Write a protein that binds this DNA or RNA. Structure first.
Lengths: 180, 262, 124
RNA sequence: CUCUCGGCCGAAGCGUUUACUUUGAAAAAA
RNA sequence: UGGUGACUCUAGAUAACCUCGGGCCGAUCGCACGCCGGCGGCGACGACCCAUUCGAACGUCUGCCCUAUCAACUUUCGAUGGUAGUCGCCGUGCCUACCAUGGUGACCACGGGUGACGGGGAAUCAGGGUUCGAUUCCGGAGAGGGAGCCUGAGAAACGGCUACCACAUCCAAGGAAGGCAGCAGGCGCGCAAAUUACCCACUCCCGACCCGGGGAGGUAGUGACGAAAAAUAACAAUACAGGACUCUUUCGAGGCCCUGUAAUUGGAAUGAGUCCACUUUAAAUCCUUUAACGAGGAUCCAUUGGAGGGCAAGUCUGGUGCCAGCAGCCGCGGUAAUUCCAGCUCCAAUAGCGUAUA
RNA sequence: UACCUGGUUGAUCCUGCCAGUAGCAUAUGCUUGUCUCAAAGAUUAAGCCAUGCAUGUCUAAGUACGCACGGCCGGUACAGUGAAACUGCGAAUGGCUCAUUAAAUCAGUUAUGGUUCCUUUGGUCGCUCGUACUUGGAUAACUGUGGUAAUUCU
């Protein structure tokens, strides 16, 4: 007996066929377009989409005046509007099935740092997040796959201790000032 | 085993105590007392977990050992004393008074009450027997035996106990049209009017109850506690009035109640 | 003058004779402020003497601007000597634990198990 | 679905017995 | 009198009994002190019986894997039932006396097996399924193997006792003491599994108890079981016998957008480390927060398998010559090997990737 | 994501199996910078065990004549703190393992109107017509004398 929880969960699935061209090609295009590191970051966002399609595909067999479909189905669309993947006029339960991987990958903090212009490339956003230069509303966020909600998109900035926004220079500029 | 168990694991605790997973292996293990250990709230959970007065299971010892806590008007120096339904907790150093009533979701509740109401409690009659040179007795759900009862008290009714003397003042009988609270099952903590009582001889009576909104439900007879004569409760009720909201309108209450902010 | 104190969840225990609260500290650019430093600035906030107040559980958040803890302000020193855990008085120099290891005491305990009446106080 | 009572509305009986189906209450926490 | 669905119930009355191995009816402790020699107020221990709580026990109904190279079993010695009792906390072949001759069996009894403790559950899965479940929760069992007890509310108890069988420690040879399937640790076994560490601060338990104790439990150490996040570089100016966009029929004209087998230049950013301090904690660590140092082959270098097809990716070069060896399968190797041994180059997953078995 | 692919012939269409493929679990190889949780002598031997620890316990309130301390005041029964020992209570829980065990265990469902229950909580406790302003004998701790190579022996 222990006071520990052993409840864990894997967050990706690997494909059934390992060496398949045009699966390899499409995921490499999605790695290069969004600045991701390995295939497992695509297989992770493929997995949260496959959980959302599957739960909506279950809710589509119950009729329109079901209790469970009306409650749990309105709570599924609410999250997808909240993270900015769906829009507001498309809140029937059948524009869930028209979602794709790219809608979910456009909402990462990495691509949003690139979209707002705080970076100048999609790989420049990965480092600027990871070097702790990026904060969201007060809080330095150190994770590039931080899915930016819709209300937290207007507050993404440059982290008041950083040499980019705050002003105290880094390791390199101060040593060159010492050698001045 | 050989002889009785003295420990309670945490996951094996009652669900309504709302103990989290990661604080320990063991749960407080109520002492034997008036209430079943599945039907009670120990005094350590009322002080540390609900009221946030204490912070550890040693401060509950330091609070109870100053004799600051009266459960039904008698001072209790056991931190795992099982307080149950309709039990009055008088803390006189601060000035509060609580009654343990279920709320609409199957748990207990912090129900602060006025010290003018804290002089009495209701009990439910459980067995009535004569004996010992023909002297009649009650047995209530607190194991309180009150000899010489009123002859019109029968089984499944409700008495009203005076807590300073121990004597019955007036009672309610089991009838239709009486206001009842469900004290067990999946309709627990719900308040409604008795509609109907179906008899099943050799099995359990089923008592159909009707809400104040129209929501009918049924229980077995043993999960039925007559609170009021007619529709007027002889005790106070919690913030919700014993009326269970479905989860859709329970969501609507939150998403409309946040819009009063600013 | 940058370090500021704010206390969120204030509550007065009249049966442990203390005021317990949850302390939010906002140091923008420094390290985690020491517990001896905050006990002065809290004593000036609550108009009392810093031998009476006790702070514990200070956890600095990520990024490094806030710090959350607990805190309790007693009524006197005798109440804060009775109602307080010994380890949180030992940080004030008021309780001094002895100097036995746990394995010394169990050896000394299990050796006088082998010896009857007054030669038990001789052993060890 | 009807007979003897209480305030037209409840008891009590059924009808040959079940399978089926729908509802209910009871089903440890994790 | 009161009750249940139903008592041989609960009460009432009468006649008696009441166990010397006795049934209750108090020869007990504390704190404030008193009111008119008496009358006292709060507690603590007790206590037969009743109720309750915590249970336990014994039953009801329904349900389980493989086997027929297991088809008849049970019945002297209880097998099924009846009567009277004995025992037992009580209901009963539980057991004894006398009877009756029954009870179960293709709807698979009885016997054997199980790499069988049972469930809650776990893996996989379109739908149906299949397989695992020793393992932290519930229930059972057991403390080397059988057996018998004492004490007690509760044990057929093993961190209690008495034997026997099996091992085995000391011995002055007469005797004495044992039981890790508790936590550590050791040997053995094996493909196969961590420290003879710190603490009662947490969660709770025991006791006469606000105070003592707890290898329960917590905290560290070992730990690529496994699961989550996630570095190993970004950017700018040049130049290209690089590409793309506007014009020139075309040569060729441009900061307009991209790319690099530029070990071209250039500062700006930063962790990993090193390390004061705070914070954390019982006390420490770790993470979080901060000083100071900390990157140009940023040598502070990323690996594991592969390149014939299944199946992503070289009939390039050297060596060997049905040899060595590769290859899950098909096949490869006999002097030009797309397959072996290597160099280069390329591919796949990537702090992980091969192999074996279920 | 309700999927297939190579292998029998000179070529073909099939039956059909081998082989690949993807999880998941035990081992193991090579490699391994950061950070959060986390299993871990089950399988074979329910094999065998050095050493140490894992079960004890006092309130105002059962028993204090230990000077072991000290303290009034010295005719003051007992100031107090208190080891020891007697008494009470616990040690039947927790922990470990999975050898047994196949209508057995167990799960759901009922029953005790066929039984016991320390404790807790409430009841009851002048309900009996018949030395007490306090009864009797021992025994530890302690003192003192010993035995045995040896034991928590006496």
């Amino acid at each position: 007996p222990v006071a520990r929880s052993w409840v864990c969960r894997k967050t990706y699935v690997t494909p059934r066929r390992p060496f398949e061209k045009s699966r390899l090609d499409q995921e490499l295009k999605l790695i290069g377009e969004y600045g991701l590191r390995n295939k497992r970051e695509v297989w992770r966002v493929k997995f949260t989409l496959a959980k959302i399609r599957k739960a909506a595909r279950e809710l589509l067999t119950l009729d329109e005046k079901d209790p469970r479909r009306l409650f749990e189905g309105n709570a599924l669309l609410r999250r997808l509007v909240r993270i900015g993947v769906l829009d507001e006029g498309k809140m029937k339960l059948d524009y869930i099935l028209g979602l794709k991987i790219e809608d979910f990958l456009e909402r990462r903090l990495q691509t949003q740092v690139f979209k707002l212009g705080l970076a100048k490339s999609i790989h420049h956003a990965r480092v600027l997040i990871r070097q702790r230069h990026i904060r969201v509303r007060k809080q330095v966020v150190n994770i590039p796959s931080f899915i930016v909600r819709l209300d937290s998109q207007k507050h993404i900035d440059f982290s008041l201790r950083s040499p980019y926004g705050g002003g105290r220079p880094g390791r390199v500029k101060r040593k060159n000032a010492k050698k001045g | 085993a050989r002889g009785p168990k003295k420990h309670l694991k945490r996951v094996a605790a009652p669900k309504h105590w709302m103990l989290d997973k990661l604080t320990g292996v063991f749960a407080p293990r109520p002492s034997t007392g008036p209430h079943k250990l599945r039907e009670c709230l120990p005094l350590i959970i009322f002080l540390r977990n609900r009221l946030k007065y204490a912070l550890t299971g040693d401060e509950v010892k330091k609070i109870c050992m100053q004799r600051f806590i009266k459960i039904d008007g008698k001072v209790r120096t056991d931190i795992t004393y099982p307080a149950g339904f309709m039990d009055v907790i008088s803390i006189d150093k601060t000035g509060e008074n609580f009654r343990l009533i279920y709320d609409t979701k199957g748990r207990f509740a912090v129900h602060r009450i006025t010290p003018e109401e804290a002089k009495y409690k209701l009990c439910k009659v459980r067995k009535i027997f004569v004996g010992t040179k023909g002297i009649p007795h009650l047995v209530t759900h607190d194991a309180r035996t009150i000899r010489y009862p009123d002859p019109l008290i029968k089984v499944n009714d409700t008495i009203q106990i005076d807590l300073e003397t121990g004597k019955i003042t007036d009672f309610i009988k089991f009838d239709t049209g009486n206001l009842c609270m469900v004290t067990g099952g999946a309709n627990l903590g719900r308040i409604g009017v008795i509609t109907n009582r179906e008899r099943h001889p050799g099995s359990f009576d089923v008592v159909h109850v009707k809400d104040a909104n129209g929501n009918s439900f049924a229980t077995r007879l043993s999960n039925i506690f007559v609170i009021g004569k007619g529709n007027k409760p002889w005790i106070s009720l919690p913030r919700g009035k014993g009326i269970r909201l479905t989860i859709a309108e329970e969501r609507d209450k939150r998403l409309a109640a946040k819009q009063s902010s600013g | 003058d940058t370090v500021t104190i704010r206390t969120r969840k204030f509550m007065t225990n009249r049966l442990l004779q203390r005021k317990q609260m949850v302390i939010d500290v906002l140091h923008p650019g420094k390290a985690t402020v020491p517990k001896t430093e905050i006990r002065e600035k809290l004593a000036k906030m609550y108009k009392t003497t810093p031998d009476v107040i006790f702070v514990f559980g200070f956890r600095t958040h990520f990024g490094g601007g806030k710090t959350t803890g607990f805190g309790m302000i007693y009524d006197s020193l005798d109440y804060a000597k009775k109602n307080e855990p010994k380890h949180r008085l030992a940080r004030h120099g008021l309780y001094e634990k002895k100097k036995t290891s746990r394995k010394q005491r169990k050896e000394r305990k299990n050796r006088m198990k082998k010896v009857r009446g007054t030669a038990k106080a001789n052993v060890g």
